[PDB]
Design a protein around this ligand. Structure first.
Ligand SMILES: OC[C@H]1O[C@@H]2O[C@H]3[C@H](O)[C@@H](O)[C@@H](O[C@H]4[C@H](O)[C@@H](O)[C@@H](O[C@H]5[C@H](O)[C@@H](O)[C@@H](O[C@H]6[C@H](O)[C@@H](O)[C@@H](O[C@H]7[C@H](O)[C@@H](O)[C@@H](O[C@H]1[C@H](O)[C@H]2O)O[C@@H]7CO)O[C@@H]6CO)O[C@@H]5CO)O[C@@H]4CO)O[C@@H]3CO
Ligand SMILES: OC[C@H]1O[C@@H]2O[C@H]3[C@H](O)[C@@H](O)[C@@H](O[C@H]4[C@H](O)[C@@H](O)[C@@H](O[C@H]5[C@H](O)[C@@H](O)[C@@H](O[C@H]6[C@H](O)[C@@H](O)[C@@H](O[C@H]7[C@H](O)[C@@H](O)[C@@H](O[C@H]1[C@H](O)[C@H]2O)O[C@@H]7CO)O[C@@H]6CO)O[C@@H]5CO)O[C@@H]4CO)O[C@@H]3CO
Length: 587
């Protein structure tokens, strides 16, 4: 099939009877004369000129002498044309940023997705995502140097495992010239950025995450076009990948193939378990208002991906409300598995930002999320996009003095981990970093030095939340089935107390109660479905995270006393600015 253009183009290693070498392949429909430079070729085009094939379009030439390990570029005349030293677009590795040349390397081996890594990707799974910018997670203390891929294999991977995440999500690791793009303005789409080491160093890093029982989600940018370093624009002299606001042309089957391959490339040749596409709204908008060319391309890919690599999922962030982004292509379209719930993020943060005394008027911000919960398969994200550009850290959004801010933050996490939808937390959120995220420095790990403090408390809470959320199927099995969620107290606006139930397929119930004001609530009676002995399995006010240790303090048995149109009732202590999770003890 014509499906994986990385398996044939690029710069492979082939044999031509005994004599060994490097079977090159580029792509230009016009051009007129393209050849190969490098260290095996003295960087001069009149030593190895390359021969065209007219039907397909690929200029090529086996070369007996150039090995895996030597630098190279290309050299072409174009539609008329000029002289251009073009970079291989299928460069599986790229030189350091002196000249940004390519490098002769093969395909890395091949990874078979396990059945356990597929099982961690499915709708009924616990999914907690640690999202990380590899360039600013951590840095060496003495010189502020990046950690390598192998150092991240030793430090980021165990830290994520211990913290209880199921997934690691990397910002784009495309090669790219500018740090401050974070990876969203790429040059080498097929090359693991050399900032952190070789391509095999990065492959080693993925096996390590895999060894630790982590899936790796990769941020994938098929919707951002290379605008820097002349790399992919006016390439052959005409407009191949580029069109005629410097966007892509997903027209030709060989711009499609380039992209479809790149998705397949990471999943198959590194072991990547999920891809996340950002800004689908900018991809399919800006005939109709739409961009029907890009709608077809996503719809296509997510069906191709669903049958080739049947276990690896896709996720999307769409900033309008294009309907059914996470619904099958046959009707609605797009065909992703998951979608980021930005609406939820905006609504709940707005709620958290409110002075607690004003919360009674904005109850709607917490209860609205159920309405549209079953229109998409949702990821509750607390992303990098939320903590830069003057938007503040998540911690600094909270009202109150220091202790009140932290208690607020803990309750919000308590609530978030209970609420229907998968989970995503950006690095530094877990220890309540005070400052906005700075891509040019390490995170504020200095906060965690010295005596045990409030940041230790939040980090502990995130790990307990992760471990409690995994474990109990009620917390994660039925995110997308109305059966998995039922309000117990939706309408206590006055006191800002919200209670609801989570449910597994067996029908076990976990009660989540949030008190969003610093007024302690004693003897708060509410109705329940399953009478019996009840017990706290989670309490954001526990002194373990530096709360006041307010709580129910033991087993609590219910009463046959009606409440909220229900036959039996629990009467509980609700701690101030706090959520608690209750479980039913078996009889
Ligand atoms: O420079 C020689 C250096 O070469 C090799 O470094 C590699 C390394 O593998 C990677 O770190 C990477 O370097 C990156 C950095 O990671 C990136 O953050 C940035 O670094 C800047 C820093 O942000 C900034 O602090 C400062 O760095 C100063 C630093 O304060 C001093 O410690 C001093 O560094 C010297 C070291 O003491 C010494 O070990 C040696 O370093 C080698 C290293 O052995 C080797 O691994 O010499 C350096 C002097 O360079 O001075 C530096 C100033 O450079 O400034 C830098 C730059 O803005 O920069 C690079 C991004 O390319 O890649 C390098 C090389 O490929
Ligand atoms: O703009 C959206 C919505 O905003 C306001 O709704 C509040 C509501 O006031 C709160 O009490 C709470 O709603 C809770 C309920 O307490 C809880 O029972 C459950 O709701 C379910 C209902 O039991 C059930 O009726 C059904 O709702 C259907 C129903 O056929 C229609 O009502 C329809 O809703 C539309 C309304 O016609 C329209 O008024 C507006 O809704 C407003 C609402 O006016 C206002 O009070 O638009 C909606 C479009 O949906 O459709 C729904 C099904 O989609 O199913 C619900 C869901 O389980 O859960 C809710 C949600 O937590 O919170 C909401 C939101 O702030």
């Amino acid at each position: 099939t014509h499906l994986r253009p990385y398996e044939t183009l690029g710069a492979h290693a082939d044999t031509m009877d005994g004599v060994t070498g490097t079977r090159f392949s580029v792509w230009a429909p016009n051009a007129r004369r393209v050849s190969v430079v490098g260290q095996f070729n003295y960087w001069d085009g009149r030593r190895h000129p390359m021969r065209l094939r007219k039907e397909s379009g690929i200029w090529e030439l086996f070369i007996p002498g150039a090995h895996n390990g030597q630098l190279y570029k290309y050299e072409m005349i174009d539609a008329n044309g000029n002289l251009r030293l073009k970079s291989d677009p299928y460069a599986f590795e790229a030189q350091m940023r002196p000249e940004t040349a390519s490098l002769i390397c093969g395909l890395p081996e091949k990874v078979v997705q396990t059945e356990e890594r597929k099982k961690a990707n499915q709708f009924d799974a616990p999914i907690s995502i640690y999202e990380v910018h590899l360039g600013s997670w951590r840095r060496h203390t003495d010189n502020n140097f990046w950690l390598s891929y192998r150092e991240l294999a030793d430090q980021l991977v165990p830290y994520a495992k211990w913290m209880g995440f199921t997934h690691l999500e990397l910002l784009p690791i495309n090669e790219h010239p500018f740090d401050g793009s974070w990876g969203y303005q790429p040059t080498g789409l097929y090359a693991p950025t050399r900032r952190f080491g070789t391509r095999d160093d990065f492959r080693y890093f993925i096996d390590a995450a895999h060894a630790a029982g982590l899936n790796v989600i990769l941020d994938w940018v098929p919707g951002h076009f290379p605008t820097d370093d002349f790399a992919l624009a006016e390439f052959d002299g005409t407009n191949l990948y580029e069109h005629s606001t410097l966007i892509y042309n997903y027209g030709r089957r060989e711009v499609s193939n380039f992209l479809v391959g790149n998705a397949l490339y990471w999943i198959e040749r590194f072991g990547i378990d999920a891809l996340r596409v950002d800004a689908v709204a900018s991809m399919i908008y800006r005939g109709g208002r739409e961009n029907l060319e890009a709608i077809e391309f996503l719809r296509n890919t997510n069906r191709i991906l669903g049958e080739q690599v049947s276990g690896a999922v896709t996720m999307a962030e769409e900033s309008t409300d294009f309907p059914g982004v996470s619904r099958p292509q046959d009707m609605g379209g797009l065909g992703f598995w998951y979608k980021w719930n930005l609406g939820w993020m905006h609504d709940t943060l707005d709620y958290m930002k409110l002075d607690p005394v004003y919360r009674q008027y904005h109850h709607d911000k917490l209860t609205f999320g159920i309405l549209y919960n079953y229109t998409e398969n949702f990821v509750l994200p607390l992303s990098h996009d939320e903590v830069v550009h003057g938007k503040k850290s998540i911690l600094d959004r909270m009202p109150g003095d220091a202790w009140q801010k932290f208690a607020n933050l803990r309750a919000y996490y308590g609530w978030m981990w209970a609420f229907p939808g998968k989970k995503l937390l950006f690095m530094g959120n877990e220890f309540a970093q005070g400052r906005e995220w700075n891509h040019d420095a390490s995170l504020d790990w200095h906060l965690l030095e010295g005596g045990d403090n409030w940041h230790h408390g939040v980090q502990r809470l995130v790990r307990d939340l992760n471990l409690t959320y995994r474990h109990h199927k009620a917390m994660h099995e039925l995110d997308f089935d109305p059966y998995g969620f039922e309000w117990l107290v939706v309408d206590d606006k006055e006191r800002s107390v919200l209670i609801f139930v989570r449910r597994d397929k067996e029908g076990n119930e976990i009660i989540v109660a949030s008190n969003f004001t610093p007024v302690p609530r004693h003897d708060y009676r509410f109705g329940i479905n399953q009478p019996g002995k009840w017990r706290e399995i989670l309490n954001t006010d526990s002194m373990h995270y530096h709360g006041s240790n307010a709580g129910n303090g033991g087993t609590v048995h219910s009463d046959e006393i009606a409440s909220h149109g229900r036959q039996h009732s629990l009467s509980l202590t609700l701690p101030p600015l706090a959520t608690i999770w209750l479980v039913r003890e078996a009889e």
